[PDB]
Each structure stands twice: as structure tokens, then as C-alpha cells.
Amino acid sequence: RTNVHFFRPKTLVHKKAPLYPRNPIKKGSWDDPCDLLRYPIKTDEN
RNA sequence: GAACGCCCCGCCGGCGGAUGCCUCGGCCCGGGCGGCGACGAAGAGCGCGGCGGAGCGCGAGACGCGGUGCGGACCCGCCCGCCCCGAGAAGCACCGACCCUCGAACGCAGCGCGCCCGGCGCCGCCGCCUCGGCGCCC
Numbered sequence: 001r002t003n004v005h006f007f008r009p010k011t012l013v014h015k016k017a018p019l020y021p022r023n024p025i026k027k028g029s030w031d032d033p034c035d036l037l038r039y040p041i042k043t044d045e046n
Numbered sequence: 047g048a049a050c051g052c053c054c055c056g057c058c059g060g061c062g063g064a065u066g067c068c069u070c071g072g073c074c075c076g077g078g079c080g081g082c083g084a085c086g087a088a089g090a091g092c093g094c095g096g097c098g099g100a101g102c103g104c105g106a107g108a109c110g111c112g113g114u115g116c117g118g119a120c121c122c123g124c125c126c127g128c129c130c131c132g133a134g135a136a137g138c139a140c141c142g143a144c145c146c147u148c149g150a151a152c153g154c155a156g157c158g159c160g161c162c163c164g165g166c167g168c169c170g171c172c173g174c175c176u177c178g179g180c181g182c183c184c
């Protein structure tokens with residue numbers, strides 16, 4: 001034995017696998033073109 | 047003397063908000079009811095109307111959207127719109143959805159950043175996968 005310390009053994013780790021979906025329907029958000037842009041600002045400076 | 051001041055013989059004006067009458071409000075008693083939340087509550091922030099400050103309401107589907115019933119001429123301003131044996135304004139009741147940030151508040155922080163390309167908090171119960179021990183044995 002080379003190291004004098006005891007560390008936790010390496011053990012298998014699993015990936016997730018939910019039995020039902022937590023978001024069954026994919027809904028929209030704030031961002032989409034024509035909603036992210038509101039209007040232009042019209043001045044003589046502009 | 048006049049005038050100022052004071053009293054009222056009377057006629058008018060101010061300033062102030064008492065009195066009287068009125069009341070979509072309080073207070074007391076009795077009867078019901080006893081119905082929140084990780085399926086994200088109570089509370090807080092911000093935003094939403096054609097002209098839109100406050101409060102009510104609503105959530106980027108925002109001063110509301112749909113479905114079943116009922117109702118049957120209006121919609122406080124300016125406009126729009128509806129109008130008829132159904133074509134459908136006000137209003138009402140139940141039901142289905144949408145539901146931004148913070149909050150028990152859940153990737154870390156509170157407004158800035160990550161690991162990973164589905165996602166990514168803590169405790170507990172029951173199972174399951176993979177494992178440690180010079181514990182008791184073989």
C-alpha cells in the first residue's frame with residue numbers, strides 16, 4: 001500500500017430516469033421575434 | 047368740538063361652521079361554516095386599458111381567453127361595436143386553461159455566475175443497483 005489514507009471506494013453512479021415527465025407540455029416564454037421587439041422611437045434626432 | 051372707543055334705536059354686509067334634519071357606515075346578540083401549502087401557500091415586487099394617475103382586478107394568453115347553461119338591449123367621456131325568431135350589448139352561476147421575479151423557496155448567488163448538454167437542493171420510509179470491514183464463519 002502506497003498512500004496511508006483511507007478514501008471512499010469507487011462505486012457505480014446512475015443517471016436519472018423519472019417514471020413520468022415533470023413537464024409533459026412544452027410551453028412558450030417571453031422571447032420570440034415579434035414579441036422581443038416592441039416599437040421604434042421616432043424623433044428628428046433619430 | 048370733532049374723531050377714536052362703548053351701547054344698541056333699528057336696517058343691511060363679512061368671518062366662522064354650531065344647531066336641526068338626513069345616512070350604501072359602525073357596534074351588540076344569535077345562527078351557519080369550518081373550506082390553505084413543494085400540484086409552490088400567506089405575503090411582497092414589477093408589469094398589463096385606444097386615449098390611463100390612485101384603488102379593485104388580472105399575469106407576456108395580462109383592465110382578460112375558452113366551454114356549458116341562463117339573460118335579452120345596451121356599452122358612465124370621446125370613439126368603437128352590437129341591432130334581425132337568434133344573428134346577441136349589460137349581467138349571473140359553475141367548469142377548463144394561462145399564471146413574470148422574490149418568498150417554506152429548491153444548481154450557487156441576488157441581479158451576477160457555474161457544472162452538464164435531459165438536467166443539476168435538504169431530510170425521512172420502502173425497494174433496488176454498486177460496494178467496504180485484521181465483525182462472526184467458511
Ligand SMILES: [Mg+2]
Binds near residue numbers: 028029
Ligand atoms: Mg405564454
Ligand SMILES: [Mg+2]
Ligand atoms: Mg392603475
Ligand SMILES: [Mg+2]
Ligand atoms: Mg429560485
